[PDB]
Design a binder for this molecule. Structure first.
Ligand code: ATP
Ligand code: ATP
Ligand code: ATP
Ligand code: ATP
Ligand code: ATP
Ligand code: ATP
Ligand code: MG
Ligand code: MG
Ligand code: MG
Ligand code: MG
Lengths: 733, 732
């Protein structure tokens, strides 16, 4: 007897059968889901005159609430109901319009870029429409759909109106990235790429998902800036930061060159007032376009362990101290090499220098370990040179102490970053990383914001979904698609700063990683902690790097190698399999399955389109679209619960039904050794670095406190197996 | 029984030797006891004591005896300290020949070689004859300590003193007039040397310490206007960093930056607020500083009607969190007639983001009539984003924060442009400097090296009103001061193109006064009862007239400044035409000089400098002349300041004869008398004045200064045309 209100404002007798019919549609093919249960929970919330839209939101939430381990398929029931609603919001009906008509409408509204209509004829759009399978919208999980609705689908940010659906996003991202291709291969490339992303084999970054097809050209999310030891450079660095955080890019700042407090300037006309005031200026630059502090501008700043002010720098994040000696809203990366670790093991001292007082020492720190030790010991014995001694154990302990309590004091092993690298350290050394410590690229300081002699490193990201591929040879096709799409994006996107354009156009660096690694391991019955996954990992990441290189090599044949290819180790016939940390042989015996020697000569002859290709990023948001486990990290639980604006979102690990015992949750792990070994094995093939976490449960330790001995042990274990960087330290509460 | 000589030789102590030294210093002094000093000194002697330490002992002994009862101890101590400095620098009392000194110092790298290129040995012999080294005996003890500490060329490592005061004076003169033709050069050098060495002209610290050395960093006063864009905010930030690294004070105009929530590029993004950008300017200002003692200093300016004004006014108080506080800068609130009108009428003030109100920001400075038109237009427009606040509440909040911190300043922007040397339509004054006496045109930069931007600089100096016998001496002194500072403009370096443009275009100078309190007591006048109004009028007419006359004659000789056409002076307008008419009610002193003759001469030949006068605080330079600080009344007859070398006492000039004539700061009833005097000054002053307000809570019931009184004085200042309000001093 109740009445419902239709969208037009008409009223109708309540019809539970209509709701039932919709529930039947979403429930198709699903198991262990109850339509009546959803009906039971939903109906009780109905009142006379309720909006049909509110009815729809009710049944979405009801199904979403029922997502559990016992009935994981509710994640698809809820998702599909939400898809049904999104269709209605965008098209006024379930079935999407013809592609060309949609594009024309959206260009007219100013939501799509007009160049789509310039680069493709109406007939070509008709063809592309035949590629699309809108039913692939029914394969998203509920968390995926919410991220779509929230971050990716083109919408009105004011009114909230949704203007598109997922497959239109996918097909037009494909269409844009391959628009400049010849007609002989263009639409063939579009279809193949569309299939790859819409069936979740290739995962794309947020700025691409939300931007590519729209009038924007801001797609850079990853920026690396090196600051020189001068006022002009500090200003330039600050300016560069401001422009890029205004475009929401994450920043990696190298400030290790800045001379220490008290150092003479121009021979003594003035004296340096310390690094920290300049660090503060970088922080306000990073936070310049942020309101409040929840998820604003983000940066990681890098400095060497032997820096004269290092004891002051290590404590910049802890909640104690006064405002004057604290710079809390950035993260930090301490740069370490073999000599530092040597002093630690020997229980000797570490000498601290200002880089301005030790000629050639800073450069050698990154490019030449033999020369560094020569210079370091030479300067250690010189009394004319300003210095300070600290016990290596005390210094390392202080560092790890702050890493533990804040979780955001990172490590960069700079020797590993240059002895095992795609770059010639004598010409293009790697002297820093990025915000999340997976990017490792060459940089050059600016003397002006528009200095054409400076080099700001950028990197375009993506990931392979290890859970969606049937066999490792599928990566051949996928690498071709990924590399070619990202490489085209380099020419597509805009560059607000000349030094950044130089790096991107000069080196054409890419960073392609993985997601669903944990699921991948459980699938094959392997685990993180017992070394059972070592050989599989070796096999898996050999395939990844080989096919990436093969794709970039063939891209180089077709369109030419990157302008600065000559500065790479690849150009000199060197491959990652030549320069890896030899200790890896003791923990993995999987043989090489691909013809690297044929590749070596093919790279020698034709070069690479891209200087780097692989990097393992955290990828927390993009993973949710594929319902994948996050990057290479193990899941914290079988079902994750996250509070949000639209309520509580539950997400189940892939194939929990059959793999619950096969999974190894994070806190089920004995320690960090097994994981660190896997990371080391990955790093054997990875061009750049890996966002590696360390994890600790205080409950597993006496007195409920993690001892320093263990922290130092794990640090050294990572270094032993060639791990380049260390990201988060997670401590279970 | 034995003393250790400088060579390390030893001889028997001879108290008669010390007695002889004390007699030299005591010559001409009254109420000083040599024996008193001897008694205090002798007790500290031990076997093998250094003669150097003996000298330091008798200096401190004499310094300790400085009092109201015996002020002349300030000269006894000083002369003893001078004696010591002579020995430290020359190995003997009498200085070497000037040329020999210069040659030695150039070789050591302490003096600039261009002195030897621009002057012949024979010319140095001539300059040496100008010098009277006995003028070193005319310093007070505080003056000598500032010399030793800040001015004399010395080794910063070892502490070695390399020169004496008269060499500083003669070589500052020689450098500033080095480019003059030989027909008149040494004549200018001698006249200028006499002026500074007899304390008639006071020079800024960066000039006193720098001019003769290899440096060219002499700018201490910088005004930068920030545009509403990322490029400009970056440019401004870079410029700030560069200038604070040269220890310049900064005035930042950030009022153009749009408010939090404003759309960007039509809604592609939304503004995240002014405050994060203010924080970025602060870290730029403090970028070359360690600790919070002194270091980088800046004042930031914004209009009262800015949409975020309520958030901006409280950026300094000690409460609140780090997120809504930017505490290490000072702020200047910009106000005009309409705001005050709304206050009096008890009406509302509407708050706008300058990005939402076309032409409103420009009119705020240049056109009050047009401002009122646009303001009321936008107030009635409902499509335009806005906020209403009670005028009483807004003014009270401002004054509340001004009182508790003392560092929230006021700029009356209409007074700064209706009574100004600049055409507001072409070159408006939209900000001030760190200490709020400077009022010059600016133009925002789109890059640190933007050659189209304009950063305002100003070169400072002051007349010592206590050292002049009559106001006609200012003719000579103005000629010397104006020519010296104008020469410095071509002498100094410019780290930023935009700064050079302003300096070369307008050649703006800021010359003020010191010893004003002493000057009033000398003439038997006081601050608070209006008895000094006409004297003040007479005095500052002479200052401005002779400054203009000097600059006008320099224009005949060397040409008017390139951008002279942007001045009101170019259109035949004088300060006496545009002053706040209310001044007629509090001063009836007639004009004593031929302003109409000057008017026609300025129309014909122009001015070398767009501005000439500005009244700065002048706390350090005042001590050299033993002058009272600027226009401010002294807080006591004897100031006590603790330092590394002990407690330094300084007596007001001629306390002996004028103790009853002085009017100390807290002997004052209120602010009315002083604000009237500042207003009368402002009639003739080109730029502005660092006017302080003072309050003694003891003089008020409940021990609290009421808001009605704060507003009362605020409106009193506005009534008499006062352009800016600097510090509020609240007695402890
Ligand atoms: N008369 C009704 N009684 C109960 N539920 C209804 C009724 N009409 C629609 N619904 C339900 O409301 C939800 C939203 O439906 P829908 O978006 O189609 O709105 P609508 O009011 O039917 O407008 P339209 O005319 O555009 O179809 C669906 O779950 C649908 O089954
Ligand atoms: N064939 C279909 N398969 C899946 N979802 C569909 C289909 N047809 C419609 N939907 C979705 O189901 C919801 C309701 O659609 P529809 O308007 O046809 O039914 P109804 O509202 O219950 O009845 P009616 O509007 O005709 O009174 C909408 O969200 C729509 O997008
Ligand atoms: N006045 C200053 N106060 C504090 N730090 C300063 C100052 N000037 C420069 N610095 C810092 O000291 C270093 C000097 O570098 P800079 O290039 O700007 O000066 P320079 O004239 O080239 O002298 P140098 O020969 O010492 O490099 C930089 O780290 C800069 O940040
Ligand atoms: N024998 C002495 N007994 C007491 N005081 C002395 C004696 N000799 C010097 N003095 C005092 O020591 C102070 C410093 O004198 P001065 O600089 O001349 O040192 P000095 O040892 O005499 O060196 P020089 O040989 O260069 O003259 C003066 O006040 C001087 O009167
Ligand atoms: N004629 C003078 N007038 C003023 N001060 C003088 C004079 N001659 C020297 N002085 C200063 O007085 C102090 C003492 O001078 P001086 O060295 O001649 O005497 P002394 O040290 O007491 O005796 P001695 O010849 O044994 O060194 C020094 O600081 C010196 O610069
Ligand atoms: N991404 C951003 N986040 C926050 N504030 C920003 C951002 N971009 C610019 N701003 C601020 O917005 C204002 C305008 O920026 P700017 O002039 O540089 O950009 P624009 O492209 O010219 O846009 P507009 O046409 O709105 O001026 C300035 O105050 C600037 O600081
Ligand atoms: Mg319907
Ligand atoms: Mg330098
Ligand atoms: Mg002697
Ligand atoms: Mg703009």
């Amino acid at each position: 007897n109740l009445l419902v209100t239709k969208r037009d404002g008409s009223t109708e007798r309540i019809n539970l059968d209509k709701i039932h019919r919709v529930l039947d549609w979403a429930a198709e093919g699903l198991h262990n889901v109850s339509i009546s249960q959803v009906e039971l929970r939903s109906h009780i919330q109905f009142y006379d005159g309720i909006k049909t839209s509110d009815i729809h939101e009710t049944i979405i939430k009801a199904a979403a609430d029922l997502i559990s381990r016992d009935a994981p398929d509710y994640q698809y029931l809820a998702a599909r109901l939400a898809i049904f609603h999104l269709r209605k919001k965008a098209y006024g009906q379930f079935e999407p319009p013809a592609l060309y008509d949609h594009v024309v409408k959206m260009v007219e509204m100013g939501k799509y870029d007009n160049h789509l209509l310039e680069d493709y004829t109406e007939e070509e759009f008709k063809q592309m429409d035949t590629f699309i399978d809108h039913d692939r919208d029914m394969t998203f999980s509920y968390a995926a759909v919410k991220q779509l609705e929230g971050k990716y689908l083109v919408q009105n940010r004011v009114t909230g109106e949704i203007y598109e659906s997922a497959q239109f996003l996918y097909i037009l991202v494909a269409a844009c990235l391959f628009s400049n291709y010849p007609r002989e291969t263009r639409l063939q490339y579009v279809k193949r790429f569309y299939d790859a992303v819409s069936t979740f084999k290739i995962s794309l970054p947020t700025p691409i998902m939300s931007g590519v097809r729209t009038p924007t050209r801001q797609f850079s999310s990853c920026v690396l800036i090196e600051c020189g030891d001068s006022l002009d450079s500090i200003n330039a660095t600050s300016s560069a930061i401001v422009k890029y955080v205004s475009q929401r890019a994450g920043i990696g700042i190298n400030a290790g060159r800045i001379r220490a407090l008290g150092s003479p300037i121009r021979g003594g006309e003035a004296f340096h007032t310390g690094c920290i005031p300049f660090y503060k200026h970088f922080q306000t630059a990073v936070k310049s376009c942020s309101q409040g502090g929840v998820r604003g501008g983000a940066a990681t700043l890098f400095y060497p362990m032997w820096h004269l002010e290092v004891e002051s720098l290590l404590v910049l994040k802890n909640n104690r101290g006064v405002e004057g000696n604290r710079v809390r809203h950035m993260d930090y990366g301490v740069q370490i090499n073999k000599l530092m670790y040597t002093r630690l093991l020997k229980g000797e001292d570490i000498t601290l220098f200002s880089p301005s007082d030790v000629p050639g020492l800073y450069d050698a720190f990154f490019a030449d370990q033999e020369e560094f030790e020569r210079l370091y010991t030479k300067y250690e014995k010189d009394d004319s040179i300003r210095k300070q001694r600290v016990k290596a154990v005390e210094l390392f302990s202080l560092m790890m102490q702050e890493r533990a309590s804040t979780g955001r004091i990172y490590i960069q092993n700079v020797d590993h970053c240059n002895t095992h690298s795609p770059f010639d350290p004598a010409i293009a050394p790697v002297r820093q990383s990025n915000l999340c410590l997976e990017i490792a690229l060459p940089t050059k300081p600016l003397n002006d914001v528009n200095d054409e002699n400076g080099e700001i490193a950028l990197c375009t990201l993506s990931a392979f979904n290890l859970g969606a591929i049937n066999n490792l040879d599928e990566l051949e096709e996928l690498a071709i698609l990924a590399v070619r799409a990202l490489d085209a994006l380099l020419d597509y996107q805009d560059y607000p700063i000349p030094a950044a354009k130089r790096g991107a156009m000069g080196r054409r660096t890419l960073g392609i990683g993985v997601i669903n690694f944990a699921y991948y391991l459980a699938k094959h019955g392997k685990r993180y902690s017992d070394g059972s996954a070592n050989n599989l990992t070796h096999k898996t990441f050999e395939a990844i790097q080989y096919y990436l290189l093969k794709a970039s090599n063939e891209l180089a044949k077709e369109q030419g190698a990157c302008p600065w290819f000559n500065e790479t180790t690849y150009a000199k016939g060197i491959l990652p399999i030549d320069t890896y940390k030899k200790d890896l042989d003791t923990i993995a015996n999987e043989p090489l399955h691909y013809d690297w020697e044929a590749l070596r000569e093919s790279i020698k002859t034709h070069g690479l389109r891209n200087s780097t290709l692989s990097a393992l990023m955290p990828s927390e948001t993009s993973s949710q679209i594929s319902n994948a486990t996050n990057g290479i990290e193990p899941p914290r639980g079988y079902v994750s619960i996250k509070a949000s604006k639209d309520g509580i979102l539950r997400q189940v690990v892939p194939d929990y039904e059959h793999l619950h015992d096969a999974y190894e949750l994070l806190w089920e792990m004995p320690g960090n050794d097994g994981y660190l070994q896997l990371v080391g094995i990955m790093q054997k093939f990875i061009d750049q670095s890996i966002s590696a976490n360390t994890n600790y449960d205080p409950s597993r330790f006496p007195s409920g406190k993690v001892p320093m001995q263990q922290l130092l042990k794990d640090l050294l274990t990572a270094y032993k197996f060639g791990v380049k960087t260390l990201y988060y330290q997670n401590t279970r509460d």
